[PDB]
PDB file of C-alpha atoms in Angstrom:
ATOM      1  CA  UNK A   1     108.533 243.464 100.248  1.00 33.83           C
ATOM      2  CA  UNK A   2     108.081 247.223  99.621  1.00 30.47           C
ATOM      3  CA  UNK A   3     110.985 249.342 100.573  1.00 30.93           C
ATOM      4  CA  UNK A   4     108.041 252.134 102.076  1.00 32.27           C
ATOM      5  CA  UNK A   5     106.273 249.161 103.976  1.00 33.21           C
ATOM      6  CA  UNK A   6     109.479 248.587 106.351  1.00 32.53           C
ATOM      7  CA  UNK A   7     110.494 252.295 106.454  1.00 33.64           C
ATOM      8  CA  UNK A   8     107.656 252.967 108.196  1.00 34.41           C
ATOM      9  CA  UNK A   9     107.904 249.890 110.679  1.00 33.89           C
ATOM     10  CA  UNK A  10     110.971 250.765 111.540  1.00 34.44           C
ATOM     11  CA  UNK A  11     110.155 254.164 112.695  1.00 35.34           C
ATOM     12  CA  UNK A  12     106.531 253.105 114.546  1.00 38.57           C
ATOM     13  CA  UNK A  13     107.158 249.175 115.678  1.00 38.79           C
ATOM     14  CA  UNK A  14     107.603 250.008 119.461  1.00 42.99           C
ATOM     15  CA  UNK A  15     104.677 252.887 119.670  1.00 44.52           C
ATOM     16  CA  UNK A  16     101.802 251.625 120.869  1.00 45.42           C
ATOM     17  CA  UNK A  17      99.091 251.263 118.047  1.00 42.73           C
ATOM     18  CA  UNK A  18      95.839 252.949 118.438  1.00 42.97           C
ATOM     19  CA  UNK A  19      92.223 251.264 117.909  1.00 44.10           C
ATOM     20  CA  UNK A  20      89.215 253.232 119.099  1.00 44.40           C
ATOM     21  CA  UNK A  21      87.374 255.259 115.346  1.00 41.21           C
ATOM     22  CA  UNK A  22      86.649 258.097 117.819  1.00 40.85           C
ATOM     23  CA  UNK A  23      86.758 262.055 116.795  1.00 42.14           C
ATOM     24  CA  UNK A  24      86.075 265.395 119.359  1.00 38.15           C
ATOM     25  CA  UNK A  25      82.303 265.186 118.976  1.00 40.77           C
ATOM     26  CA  UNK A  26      81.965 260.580 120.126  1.00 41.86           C
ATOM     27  CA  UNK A  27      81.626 261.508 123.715  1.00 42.29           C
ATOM     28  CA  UNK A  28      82.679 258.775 126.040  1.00 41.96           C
ATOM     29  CA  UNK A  29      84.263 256.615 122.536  1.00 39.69           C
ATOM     30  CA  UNK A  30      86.336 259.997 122.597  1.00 39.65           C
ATOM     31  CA  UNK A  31      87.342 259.631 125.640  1.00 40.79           C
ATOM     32  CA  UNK A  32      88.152 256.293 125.000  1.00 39.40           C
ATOM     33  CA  UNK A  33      90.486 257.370 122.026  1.00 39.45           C
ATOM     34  CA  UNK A  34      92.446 260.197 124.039  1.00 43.19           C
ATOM     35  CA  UNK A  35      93.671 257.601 126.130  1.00 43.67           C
ATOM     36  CA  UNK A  36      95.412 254.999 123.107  1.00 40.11           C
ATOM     37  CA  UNK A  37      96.601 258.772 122.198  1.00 40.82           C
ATOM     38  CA  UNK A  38      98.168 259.619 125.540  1.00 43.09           C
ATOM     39  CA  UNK A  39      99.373 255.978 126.727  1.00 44.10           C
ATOM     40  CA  UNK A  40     100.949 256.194 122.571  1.00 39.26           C
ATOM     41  CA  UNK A  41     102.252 259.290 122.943  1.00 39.31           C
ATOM     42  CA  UNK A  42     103.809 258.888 126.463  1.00 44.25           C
ATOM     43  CA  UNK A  43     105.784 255.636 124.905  1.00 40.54           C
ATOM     44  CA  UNK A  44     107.164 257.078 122.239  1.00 41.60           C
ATOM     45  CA  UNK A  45     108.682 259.942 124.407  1.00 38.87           C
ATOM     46  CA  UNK A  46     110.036 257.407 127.259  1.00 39.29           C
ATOM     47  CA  UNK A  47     111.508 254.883 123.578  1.00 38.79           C
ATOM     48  CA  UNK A  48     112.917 258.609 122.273  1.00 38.36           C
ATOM     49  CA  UNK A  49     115.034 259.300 125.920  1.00 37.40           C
ATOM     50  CA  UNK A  50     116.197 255.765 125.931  1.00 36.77           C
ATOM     51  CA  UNK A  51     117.124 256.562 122.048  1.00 35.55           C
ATOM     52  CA  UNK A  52     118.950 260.349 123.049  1.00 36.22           C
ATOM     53  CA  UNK A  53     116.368 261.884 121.001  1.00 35.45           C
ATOM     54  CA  UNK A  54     114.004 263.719 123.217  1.00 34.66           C
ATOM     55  CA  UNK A  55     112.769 266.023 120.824  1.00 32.75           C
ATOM     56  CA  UNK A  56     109.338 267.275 121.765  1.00 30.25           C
ATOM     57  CA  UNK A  57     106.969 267.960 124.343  1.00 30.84           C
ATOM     58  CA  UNK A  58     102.952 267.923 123.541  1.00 30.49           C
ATOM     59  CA  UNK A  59      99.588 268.850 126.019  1.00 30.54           C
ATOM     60  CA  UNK A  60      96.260 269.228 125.444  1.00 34.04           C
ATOM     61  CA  UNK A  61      92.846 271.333 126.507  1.00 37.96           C
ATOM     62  CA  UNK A  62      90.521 269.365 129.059  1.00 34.66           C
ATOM     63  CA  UNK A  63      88.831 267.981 125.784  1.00 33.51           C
ATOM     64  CA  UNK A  64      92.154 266.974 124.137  1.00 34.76           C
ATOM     65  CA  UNK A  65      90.880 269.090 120.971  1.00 35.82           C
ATOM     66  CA  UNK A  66      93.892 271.468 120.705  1.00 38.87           C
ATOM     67  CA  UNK A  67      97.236 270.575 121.245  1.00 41.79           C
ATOM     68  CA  UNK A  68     100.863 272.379 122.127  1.00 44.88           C
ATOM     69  CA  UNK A  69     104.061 272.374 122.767  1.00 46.94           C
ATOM     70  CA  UNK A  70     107.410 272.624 121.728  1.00 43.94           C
ATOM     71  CA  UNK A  71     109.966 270.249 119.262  1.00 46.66           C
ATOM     72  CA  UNK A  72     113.936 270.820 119.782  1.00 45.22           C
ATOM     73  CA  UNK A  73     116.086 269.617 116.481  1.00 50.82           C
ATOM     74  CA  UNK A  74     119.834 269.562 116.861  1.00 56.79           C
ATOM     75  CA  UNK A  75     122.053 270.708 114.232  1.00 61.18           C
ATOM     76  CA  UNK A  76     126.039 271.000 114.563  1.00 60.29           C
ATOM     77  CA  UNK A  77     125.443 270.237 117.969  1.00 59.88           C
ATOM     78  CA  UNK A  78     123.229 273.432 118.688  1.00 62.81           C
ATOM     79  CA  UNK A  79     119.444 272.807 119.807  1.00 62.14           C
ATOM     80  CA  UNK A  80     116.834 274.893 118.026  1.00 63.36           C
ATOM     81  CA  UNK A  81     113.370 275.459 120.151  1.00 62.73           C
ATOM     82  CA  UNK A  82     110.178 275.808 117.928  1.00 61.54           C
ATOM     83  CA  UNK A  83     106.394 275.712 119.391  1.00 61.23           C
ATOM     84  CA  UNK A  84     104.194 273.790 117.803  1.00 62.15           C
ATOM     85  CA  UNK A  85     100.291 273.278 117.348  1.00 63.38           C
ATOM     86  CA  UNK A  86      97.533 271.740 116.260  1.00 64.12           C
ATOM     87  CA  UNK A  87      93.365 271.317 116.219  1.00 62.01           C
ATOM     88  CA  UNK A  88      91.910 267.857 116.268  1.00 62.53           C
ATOM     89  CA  UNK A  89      89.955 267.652 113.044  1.00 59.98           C
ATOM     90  CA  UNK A  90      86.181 266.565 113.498  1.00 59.60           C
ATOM     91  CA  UNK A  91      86.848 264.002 111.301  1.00 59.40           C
ATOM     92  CA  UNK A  92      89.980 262.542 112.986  1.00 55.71           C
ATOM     93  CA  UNK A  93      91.710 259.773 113.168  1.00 56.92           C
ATOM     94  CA  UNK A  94      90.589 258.828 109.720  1.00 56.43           C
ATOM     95  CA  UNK A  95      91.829 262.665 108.691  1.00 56.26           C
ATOM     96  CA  UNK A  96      94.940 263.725 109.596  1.00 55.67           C
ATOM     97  CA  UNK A  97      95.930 266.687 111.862  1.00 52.32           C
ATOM     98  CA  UNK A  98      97.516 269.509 110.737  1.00 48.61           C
ATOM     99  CA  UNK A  99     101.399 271.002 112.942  1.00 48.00           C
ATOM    100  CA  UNK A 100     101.552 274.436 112.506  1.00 50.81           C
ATOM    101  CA  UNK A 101     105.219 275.930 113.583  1.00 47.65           C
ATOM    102  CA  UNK A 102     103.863 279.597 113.495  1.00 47.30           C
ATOM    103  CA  UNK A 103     107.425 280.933 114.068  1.00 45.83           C
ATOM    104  CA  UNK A 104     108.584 279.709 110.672  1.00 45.91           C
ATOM    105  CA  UNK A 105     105.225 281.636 108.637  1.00 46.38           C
ATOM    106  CA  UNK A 106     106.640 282.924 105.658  1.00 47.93           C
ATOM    107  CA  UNK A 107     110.457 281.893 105.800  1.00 46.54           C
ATOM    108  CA  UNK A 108     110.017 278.490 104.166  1.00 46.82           C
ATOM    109  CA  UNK A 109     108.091 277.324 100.564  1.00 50.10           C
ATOM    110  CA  UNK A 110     107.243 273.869 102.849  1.00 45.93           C
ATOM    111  CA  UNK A 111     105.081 275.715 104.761  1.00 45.18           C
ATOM    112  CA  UNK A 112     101.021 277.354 103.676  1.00 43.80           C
ATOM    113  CA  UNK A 113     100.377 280.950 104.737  1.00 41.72           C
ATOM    114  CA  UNK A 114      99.189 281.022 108.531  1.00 39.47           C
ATOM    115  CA  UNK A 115     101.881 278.540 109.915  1.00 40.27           C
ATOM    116  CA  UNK A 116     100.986 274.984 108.448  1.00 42.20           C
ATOM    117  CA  UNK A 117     103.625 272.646 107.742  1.00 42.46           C
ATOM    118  CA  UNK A 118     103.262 271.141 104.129  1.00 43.98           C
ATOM    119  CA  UNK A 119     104.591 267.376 104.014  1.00 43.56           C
ATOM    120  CA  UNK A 120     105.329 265.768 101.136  1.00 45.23           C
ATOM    121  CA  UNK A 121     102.775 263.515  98.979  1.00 47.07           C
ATOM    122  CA  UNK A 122     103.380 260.601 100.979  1.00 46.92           C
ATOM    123  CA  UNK A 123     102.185 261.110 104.278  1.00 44.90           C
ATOM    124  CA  UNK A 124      98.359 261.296 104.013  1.00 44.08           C
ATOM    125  CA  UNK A 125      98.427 258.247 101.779  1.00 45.16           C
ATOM    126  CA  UNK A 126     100.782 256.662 104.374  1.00 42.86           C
ATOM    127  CA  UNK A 127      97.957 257.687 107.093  1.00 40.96           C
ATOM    128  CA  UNK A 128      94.930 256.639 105.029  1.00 44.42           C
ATOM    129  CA  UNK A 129      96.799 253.015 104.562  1.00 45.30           C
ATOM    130  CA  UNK A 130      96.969 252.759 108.622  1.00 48.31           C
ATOM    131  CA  UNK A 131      93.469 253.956 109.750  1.00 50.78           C
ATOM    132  CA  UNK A 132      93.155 254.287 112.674  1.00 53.53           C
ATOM    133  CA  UNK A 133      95.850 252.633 113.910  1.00 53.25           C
ATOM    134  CA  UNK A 134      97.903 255.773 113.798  1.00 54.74           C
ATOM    135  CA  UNK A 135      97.408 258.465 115.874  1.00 56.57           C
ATOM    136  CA  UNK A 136      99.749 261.582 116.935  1.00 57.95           C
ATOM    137  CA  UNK A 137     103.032 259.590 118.611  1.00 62.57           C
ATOM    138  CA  UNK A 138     102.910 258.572 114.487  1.00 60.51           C
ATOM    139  CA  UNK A 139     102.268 261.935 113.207  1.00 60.23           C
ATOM    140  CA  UNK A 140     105.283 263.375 115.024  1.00 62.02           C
ATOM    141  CA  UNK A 141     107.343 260.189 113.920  1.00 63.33           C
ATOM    142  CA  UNK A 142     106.598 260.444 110.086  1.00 65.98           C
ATOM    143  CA  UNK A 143     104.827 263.899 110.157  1.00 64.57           C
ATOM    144  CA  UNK A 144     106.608 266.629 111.813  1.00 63.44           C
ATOM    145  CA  UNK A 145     110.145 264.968 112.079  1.00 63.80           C
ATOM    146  CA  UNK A 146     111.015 264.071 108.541  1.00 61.94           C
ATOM    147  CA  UNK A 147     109.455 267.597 107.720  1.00 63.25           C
ATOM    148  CA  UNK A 148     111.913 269.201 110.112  1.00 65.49           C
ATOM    149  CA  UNK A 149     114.952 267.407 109.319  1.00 63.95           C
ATOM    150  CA  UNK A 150     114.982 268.532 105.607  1.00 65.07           C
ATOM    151  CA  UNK A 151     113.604 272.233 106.478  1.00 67.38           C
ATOM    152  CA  UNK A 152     115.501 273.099 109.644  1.00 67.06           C
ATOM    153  CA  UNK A 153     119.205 272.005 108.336  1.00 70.12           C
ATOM    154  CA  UNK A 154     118.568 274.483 104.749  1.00 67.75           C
ATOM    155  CA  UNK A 155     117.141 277.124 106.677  1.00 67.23           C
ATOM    156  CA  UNK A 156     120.252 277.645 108.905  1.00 67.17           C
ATOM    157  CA  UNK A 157     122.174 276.763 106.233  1.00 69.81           C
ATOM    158  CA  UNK A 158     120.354 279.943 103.914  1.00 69.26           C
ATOM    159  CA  UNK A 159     120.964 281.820 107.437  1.00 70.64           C
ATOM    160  CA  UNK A 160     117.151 282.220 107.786  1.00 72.19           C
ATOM    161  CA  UNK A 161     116.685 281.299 111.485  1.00 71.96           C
ATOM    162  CA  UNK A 162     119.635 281.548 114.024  1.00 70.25           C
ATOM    163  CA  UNK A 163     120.389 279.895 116.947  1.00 73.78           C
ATOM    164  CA  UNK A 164     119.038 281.857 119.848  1.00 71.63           C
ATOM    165  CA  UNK A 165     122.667 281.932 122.576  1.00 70.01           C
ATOM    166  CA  UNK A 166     121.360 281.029 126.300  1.00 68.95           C
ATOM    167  CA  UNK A 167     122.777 279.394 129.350  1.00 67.33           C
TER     168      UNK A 167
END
């Protein structure tokens, strides 16, 4: 009956849920978990182009330790490109990663020194509830994207980033 319980169902009911307690060091279990994480991930983006939001693009290293890419976030009908990252924590998927969007260091307060976004209290409670059926399709859903449509609307708005003009 919670209000927070079907929030978060209906932003993760259609990505595929994730089952293998498996972190960068569990060898073959690991190898086992990068492919929930890809065959998750991979859904979410085909469900986000059905959806006309295709708002990010992720890869990994060989070991599927560090992660890339970029996120796009459309405001007044301009798209604004940022490149994202982020290490696989040793104790993953019962800890959650951490996006940097080094670009932004230093030109928001919802970000720590070096590039890390800073979500609000609710997220790694949110995460802890769900292990390890969440993995990173989820923490771009109720990670990254919440986080960017609350910062990324204020900072154009305090004229703090601008829209780089291309065609």
């Amino acid at each position: 009956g919670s209000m927070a319980d079907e929030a978060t169902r209906r932003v993760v009911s259609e990505i595929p849920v994730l089952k293998t307690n498996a972190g960068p060091r569990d060898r073959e279990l690991w190898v086992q978990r990068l492919k929930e994480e890809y065959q998750s991930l991979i859904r979410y983006v085909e469900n986000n182009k059905n959806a006309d939001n295709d708002w990010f693009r992720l890869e990994s290293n060989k070991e599927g330790t560090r992660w890339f890419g970029k996120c796009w976030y459309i405001h007044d009908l301009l798209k604004y490109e940022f490149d994202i990252e982020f290490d696989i924590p040793i104790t993953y998927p019962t800890t959650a990663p951490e996006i940097a969007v080094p670009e932004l260091d230093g030109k928001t307060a919802k970000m720590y020194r070096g590039g890390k976004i800073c979500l609000t209290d609710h997220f790694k409670p949110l995460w802890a509830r769900n292990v390890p059926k969440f993995g990173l399709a989820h923490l771009m859903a109720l990670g990254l994207g919440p986080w960017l449509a609350v910062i990324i609307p204020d900072l154009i708005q305090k004229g703090v980033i601008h829209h780089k003009e291309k065609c």
